[PDB]
Design a protein around this ligand. Structure first.
Ligand code: HEM
Ligand code: HEM
Ligand code: HEM
Ligand code: HEM
Ligand code: HEM
Ligand SMILES: COc1c(O)c(C)c(C/C=C(\C)CC/C=C(\C)CC/C=C(/C)CC/C=C(\C)CC/C=C(\C)CCC=C(C)C)c(O)c1OC
Ligand SMILES: COc1c(O)c(C)c(C/C=C(\C)CC/C=C(\C)CC/C=C(/C)CC/C=C(\C)CC/C=C(\C)CCC=C(C)C)c(O)c1OC
Ligand SMILES: C/C=C(C)/C=C/C=C/C(OC)[C@@H](C)[C@H](OC)[C@@H](C)CCc1oc2c(O)c(OC)cc(OC)c2c(=O)c1C
Ligand SMILES: C/C=C(C)/C=C/C=C/C(OC)[C@@H](C)[C@H](OC)[C@@H](C)CCc1oc2c(O)c(OC)cc(OC)c2c(=O)c1C
Lengths: 62, 385, 55, 245, 125, 93, 385
């Protein structure tokens, strides 16, 4: 076969009438994963940091 | 060159995590190792924050853990993460090991990689036992008693080792204070052994599911397997979260919510689930010395597999008899654990003794015989003279 | 989708916007969940029991 | 092992706190405290529960303060060094009936009534077990069973022979909220109260779990999508071989 | 296990028409269940190569077979990662599933065995 | 620098594979490909394949061990019931 | 090749410890680094064995250390090794740093090496403070109080940091339990930083007393410097032994044999000797915020030396003015420490403020001016036009 004759990718290629379809989907997904991760990391860090604050049993009102 | 390459610290990161050439075809079974590193981090971080609130004195240890549960903000989350994480650490380790078994990862040139792995496994088992003792519930006290007594089986100087390990006449304050100190230490030795594990991994690279060379088609770690790792990291966290928040005590033992009592061993005593197969193996031998020898040998026999696997191809993917007997091994191992959870009673004692035999026979007999037969079958099926 | 190309316009979302959105999410999400949770458990809460005691 | 030695399997009652979205019923907790105070506390300590934890759970700040002050605790010695006592405060732990173990065994035919702070977590079966035990004393033991003197029969206890007699009887308690104090109602209530004693973080823990599981679920589904995208070039890659001359 | 030893046992079976008619059908069915032909591989492509015998052997392989092994291996990895098998018309046929590397391996094992023999020869006077 | 043991993997540009000639590969940007609503219709009758080959290797050892477990358990139950206390005396010590 | 080269683990050992090419002319001042590794090992080993007997509860901590002193076999040896070893660790660190200062070891291409060193120094100071608090004597309590309060000087959120560090209203049980947990951790982070220190050392090798290239005449680490290291290892042990057995409390403070008392600060309170120069610097500034800023800056200003050393030759060996002012710096540093040990009284307050100025002026003013002058002097002394 001739290397200039590119194999068929038609089953995979998005029939491009909308150019930035996959880009907008990918960047939304990547953006949303970034959002929920940062909120998750923030909550995880606060959980640990707050375990070092005064314990419920040592807050005595003398 | 790029800074990630030229800098002394970053180049380590680059060669292990970014540009590291991976075989294109490794499947999700190769995600377990990163999950083990993650587990190691979860155990260390949650343990240090708990240590801040923990007292190792035998009078105070159980109450100091109740104090973490009740008074420390998010304390129950730390404790339940640690306890359930230890279990998840073993689930994933068994899968990592089973993966290695199936795909011939223990084979040359990765024998050193495998041997260091077996050391990590022993260290991880010892670390979890030390931690379990620190709670000082009923299972803690008698676990400490039974396991330190393993060494009394040693000829002549055995009871001397035990009293030295105890720091006195029985499992007491000296014992629990030194077991906490040791529980803190060994995770860091495991960390150093993991680095040695990754060093041996790096010089030959990962294997792959076909069992053949990966040299003809590599893709970089970065992007492809970084984000593929992320998929199983989140699935792992999801499931660990379901236990920690919704079912935090399902993988433990109710007797360890009872303070340890030196005068009473509960009838309901059962080892931690991840120790059950090994427990069963020991219990199957009606002799003290030989019971503890056979149990230790059940771990060391993992070292024998590079020599008893006689096959000429790496891994079980294209091997009909080896696949079948591999799953005999796995389900035999589950049975050993179900026997461990049972009473020393009629059908169970014999089943455990036969399952014990099957366990050892796999490495020493089945694999060498079957892999030889498969060698010959592959040959006479294609050669015409 | 063209909802993306109005806000971020073929570019990826940047860390600053991600971090900012996360702070917003944290508060909104917490209130939404606490609300559903306390409602689902109406009758059983201490809030609800205190409404039937006075001394 | 024989069924008697194992003990009868406790059945699954429909506790209102069972289920991932369910809080405790705090009215049942309130009632359960009364049953503990008026029946159980005569033999059972509750050492790990501090008065302050009741506030906002089952009682008001004022109610708990009155309850704590009904008890005397050791105070710091006076200016001259002689010992002295003190009414209880919210920082104090709920006091037990006996001064030491030996005094507790003396009052119970040599048996030791366990502390109940953790009892729901320290037994297989949890709430189902505790409830079933309390409501499961038969008027007479099954035929042939020879009970030791001072022992009682209960099928749910391992071995059948338990050193606690039945103590719940109909209307031995006057519920402050009007509820008919039947034995199964009182059992249901203390048991709910004792689950809270053992698991005070229950309601909050499940609320946090709901958030954690939603975020992690989403992150899981999201990462799958992102992985597939990042792999699409490799997965649909195609090779051709033209053998070299 | 050496290929010299697999060849010894295998040839003994292949000649004696008692065993030959008994085993080869079993072996043929084992090879089909193995499945490597559905990935486009020949058995000899499957031999673990990280040892001196196999490196000697692969070094001595003629160019055209070498390029062909390379394609079959790359094509196998790509198909494996897509969780497919090849189109059936692309499978390796039994006529093609030849021991192409075997003669180079056996030759290298014999050379190696002789060196080990000669390095350790005793002498008698 | 400090020397180095010979291995079976190199690095980009010298991986240690054989010389490759004649193989030509093609690929297409993920960006240019159909957003992930494809799989299904084309790929769900496809997969669920790789476990038709495998399920017997798992299921038959599983079956053997589950049967063996259920049997031993039901036997233990019999032994410790009334009906079996005679057999219990026999098989015990 | 030789096995020590070919093996994955041994080759690390070979390239760092055996075949590592050293400049032929390095003198005994280059023995301090191995002595620091030895110190790190002594501290970790003796600390772990003591941890086995130690209780971190604020009620029990002081008595648990008396228990190590009185009841633990060889317990007084462990405690005195640890306490005196901490001091010896600082003596040797100061010498290692002073060596670096004198010979221009901070210069390019060893800037990264120097910066990692400054981090280790900060970590080592924090580690010793955490350990000192664990005794819970009088100096422990007020040391913990004063040093956690350093952070209260932080604008707006400072008192919040302090109450978070304390775990309550004042230095109490939460505080001492978390300080023990942290004291156990940080030595292992120091160990990881030492590895990063040796990594940066390895790519450029050691410098030498001439300040010029070592590339023309190297000799292997093994034999020559292994046995040369041994000479100072034994001398170090001899002297440490004289203190541990004959004078074990000479380097400490008598007030730390008194249990901590939250209501009384002794009039005799003095910081540990190795913290005195820094203490003096803080005390010299009659403002809270600026006192703690200036003290921290006295450590960070070490980072500035690669930029303010304008010289064109590495090191002070052939530099008359630089040698003189180097020793002004050293003896100025000793004075700062002698001021720290003194009362806040007339002559001392002014002397401390002037010595503080001299300390900073050395890095920021003297070295840039003098090294420029020496540059020019070297030139006009040989050029004839
Ligand atoms: C009040 C309603 C009440 C409760 C609740 C209760 C519970 C309880 C449990 C759950 C146990 C543990 C049983 C086990 O081991 O599984 C237990 C044990 C004893 N109790 Fe009790 N108990 C209640 C009330 C009373 C009262 C008022 C008395 C004293 C007269 C009493 C005594 C005991 C004793 C004794 C035991 C020990 C049982 C044994 O070891 O055999 N309880 N109780
Ligand atoms: C590989 C790492 C580790 C493993 C597998 C591990 C495992 C365990 C286990 C099984 C327990 C008992 C869990 C239970 O409560 O039922 C435990 C307890 C404990 N561990 Fe670890 N541990 C590890 C590391 C650490 C580290 C580094 C610390 C740091 C001090 C630590 C501190 C503790 C403490 C304080 C307890 C008692 C609290 C508790 O019971 O959860 N652990 N550990
Ligand atoms: C804390 C424990 C461990 C960690 C962090 C760890 C980590 C890793 C990592 C990152 C990999 C590469 C990815 C993978 O194949 O999953 C790997 C590979 C491997 N590990 Fe481990 N491992 C651990 C324990 C073990 C154990 C217990 C064994 C065996 C007894 C072992 C045997 C192997 C082998 C043989 C490989 C190579 C697999 C192959 O490429 O085919 N590991 N490990
Ligand atoms: C670079 C390492 C270390 C340094 C510089 C260091 C320094 C110190 C210092 C200054 C003290 C107080 C000495 C005194 O009694 O006057 C101390 C106490 C203590 N250290 Fe460390 N330490 C180190 C590592 C360790 C480690 C890894 C442990 C392990 C748990 C440890 C455990 C303890 C204990 C138990 C005490 C209290 C006993 C005593 O007062 O000597 N230390 N440390
Ligand atoms: C626990 C602490 C440390 C360890 C184990 C350590 C160890 C070493 C070793 C083994 C060497 C080579 C031999 C020598 O020159 O003595 C070295 C060199 C060096 N270290 Fe450190 N070091 C430590 C702390 C520091 C600190 C605190 C600094 C400076 C702030 C520092 C600065 C340097 C420099 C600049 C060199 C190169 C000296 C030259 O070759 O001229 N080190 N260190
Ligand atoms: C060729 O094969 C590979 C491969 O090489 C790699 C790297 C990966 C990817 C996986 C990894 C890189 C795993 C890496 C992780 C480790 C080696 C972790 C080692 C373990 C540790 C425990 C880290 C050390 C941690 C600590 C000391 C804890 C820090 C403590 C803190 C911050 C306490 C904070 C608290 C207070 C109060 C101050 C692969 O997936 C892979 O095959 C596909
Ligand atoms: C180019 O320049 C160099 C150079 O590179 C080197 C290496 C040296 C020689 C010096 C060294 C090699 C120093 C090396 C030492 C280290 C890096 C040590 C790191 C620190 C540690 C703390 C080690 C880790 C230790 C532990 C975890 C402790 C082990 C604990 C145990 C056994 C507990 C036992 C107890 C019980 C109850 C089980 C030079 O002298 C030199 O210039 C002349
Ligand atoms: C300082 C450190 C010391 C002294 C000890 C470390 C080393 C020991 C081990 O391996 C490293 C050891 C854990 C062993 O490994 C063979 C495990 C498989 C243990 C298996 C095990 O568990 C039990 C257990 O958990 C129990 O709990 C309630 C009770 C038990 O009896 C009823 C056992 C038991 O009978 C056995 C064999
Ligand atoms: C979790 C860890 C935490 C919160 C803290 C770690 C970090 C802090 C430090 O550096 C890392 C810190 C030690 C500082 O470094 C600038 C040292 C030079 C401290 C110098 C120091 O010592 C004193 C001391 O020892 C005392 O004893 C009786 C008493 C003291 O007053 C009288 C002092 C004092 O007034 C100062 C400035």
């Amino acid at each position: 076969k001739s290397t200039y004759r590119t194999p068929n990718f038609d089953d995979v290629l998005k029939e491009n009438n909308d150019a930035d379809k996959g880009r907008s989907y990918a960047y939304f997904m990547v953006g949303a994963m970034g959002l929920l991760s940062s909120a998750g990391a923030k909550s995880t860090v606060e959980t640990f940091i707050s375990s070092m604050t005064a314990t419920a049993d040592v807050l005595a009102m003398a | 060159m790029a800074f990630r390459k030229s800098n002394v610290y970053l180049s380590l990161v680059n060669s292990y995590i970014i540009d590291s050439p991976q075989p294109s075809s490794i499947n999700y079974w190769w995600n377990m190792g990163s999950l083990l590193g993650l587990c190691l981090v979860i155990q260390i971080v949650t343990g240090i924050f708990m240590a801040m609130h923990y007292s190792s004195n035998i009078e105070l240890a159980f109450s100091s853990v109740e104090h973490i549960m009740r008074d420390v903000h998010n304390g129950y989350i730390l404790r339940y993460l640690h306890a359930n994480g230890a279990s998840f650490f073993f689930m994933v380790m068994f899968m990592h090991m089973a993966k290695g078994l199936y795909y011939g990862s223990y084979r040359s040139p990765r024998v050193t990689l495998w041997n260091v792995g077996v050391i990590i496994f022993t260290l991880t088992i010892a670390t979890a036992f030390l931690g379990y003792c620190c709670v000082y519930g009923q299972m803690s006290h008698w676990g400490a008693t039974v396991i330190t007594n393993l060494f009394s089986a040693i000829p002549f100087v055995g009871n001397d080792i035990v009293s030295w390990l105890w720091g006195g006449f029985s499992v007491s304050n000296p014992t629990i204070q030194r077991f906490f100190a040791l529980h803190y230490l060994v995770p860091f030795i495991i960390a150093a052994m993991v680095i040695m594990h990754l060093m041996a991994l790096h010089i030959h690279g990962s294997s792959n599911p076909l069992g053949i060379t990966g040299n003809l088609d590599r893709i970089p770690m970065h992007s492809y397997f970084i984000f593929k790792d992320l998929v199983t990291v989140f699935l792992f966290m999801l499931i660990l979260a379901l236990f920690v928040f919704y079912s935090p005590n399902t993988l433990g033992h109710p007797d360890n919510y009872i303070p340890g009592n030196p005068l009473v061993t509960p009838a309901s005593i059962v080892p931690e689930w991840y120790l059950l197969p090994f427990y069963a193996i020991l219990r199957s031998i009606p002799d003290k010395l030989l019971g503890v020898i056979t149990m230790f040998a059940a771990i060391l026999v993992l070292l024998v597999l590079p020599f008893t696997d006689r096959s000429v191809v790496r891994g079980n993917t294209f091997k009909v008899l080896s696949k079948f007997f591999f799953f005999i091994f796995v389900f035999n191992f589950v049975l050993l654990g179900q026997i461990g959870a049972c009473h020393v009673e009629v059908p169970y004692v014999l089943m455990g003794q036969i399952a014990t035999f099957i366990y050892f026979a796999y490495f020493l007999i089945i694999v060498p015989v079957i892999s030889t037969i498969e060698n010959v079958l592959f040959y006479i099926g294609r050669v015409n003279k | 989708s063209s909802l993306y190309k109005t806000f971020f316009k073929r570019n990826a979302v940047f860390v600053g916007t991600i971090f900012a959105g996360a702070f917003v999410f944290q508060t909104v999400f917490d209130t939404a969940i606490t609300s559903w949770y306390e409602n689902h458990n109406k009758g059983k809460l201490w809030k609800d029991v205190k409404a039937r005691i006075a001394a | 092992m024989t069924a008697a030695e194992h003990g009868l399997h406790a059945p699954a009652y429909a506790w209102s706190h069972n289920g991932p979205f369910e809080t405790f019923d705090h009215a049942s907790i309130r009632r359960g405290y009364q049953v503990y105070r008026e029946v159980c506390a005569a033999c059972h300590s509750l050492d790990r529960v501090a008065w302050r934890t009741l506030v906002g759970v089952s009682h008001t700040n004022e109610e708990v303060r009155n309850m704590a002050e009904e008890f005397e605790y050791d105070d710091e010695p006076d200016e001259q060094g002689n010992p002295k006592k003190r009414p209880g405060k919210l920082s104090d732990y709920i006091p037990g009936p006996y001064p030491n173990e030996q005094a507790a065994r003396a009052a119970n035919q040599g048996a030791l009534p366990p502390d109940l702070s953790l009892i729901v977590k320290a037994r297989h079966g949890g709430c189902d077990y505790i409830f079933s035990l309390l409501t499961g004393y038969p008027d007479e033991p099954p035929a042939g069973v020879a009970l030791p003197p001072g022992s009682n029969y209960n099928p749910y206890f391992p071995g059948g022979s338990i050193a606690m007699a039945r103590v719940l009887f109909d209307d031995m308690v006057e519920y402050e909220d009007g509820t008919p104090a039947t034995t199964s109602q009182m059992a249901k209530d203390v048991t709910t109260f004792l689950n809270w004693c053992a698991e005070p973080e229950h309601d909050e823990r499940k609320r946090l779990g709901l958030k954690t599981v939603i975020i992690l679920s989403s992150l899981y589904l999201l990462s799958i999508w992102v992985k597939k995208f990042k792999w699409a070039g490799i997965k649909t890659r195609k090779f051709v071989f033209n053998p070299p001359k | 296990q050496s290929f010299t030893s697999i060849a010894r046992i295998g040839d003994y079976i292949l000649k004696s028409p008692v065993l030959s008619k008994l085993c080869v059908p079993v072996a043929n069915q084992f090879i089909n269940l193995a499945g490597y032909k559905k990935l486009g591989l020949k058995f000899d492509d499957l031999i673990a190569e990280e040892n001196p015998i196999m490196q000697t052997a692969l070094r001595r392989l003629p160019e055209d077979e070498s390029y062909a092994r390379a394609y079959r291996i790359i094509r196998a990895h790509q198909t494996e990662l897509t969780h497919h098998l090849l189109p059936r018309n692309e499978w390796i046929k039994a006529q093609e599933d030849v021991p192409y590397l075997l003669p180079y391996i056996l030759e290298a094992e014999a050379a190696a065995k002789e060196k080990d023999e000669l390095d350790n020869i005793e002498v008698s006077k | 620098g400090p020397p180095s043991g010979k291995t079976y993997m190199g690095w980009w540009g010298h991986m240690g594979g054989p010389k490759q000639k004649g193989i030509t590969s093609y690929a297409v940007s993920p960006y240019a490909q159909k957003p992930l609503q494809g799989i299904f219709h084309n790929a769900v009758f496809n997969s669920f394949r790789r476990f038709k080959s495998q399920f017997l290797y798992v299921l038959i050892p599983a079956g053997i061990y589950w049967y063996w477990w259920k049997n031993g358990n039901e036997y233990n139950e019999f032994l410790y019931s009334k009906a079996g206390r005679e057999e219990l005396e026999r098989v015990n010590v």
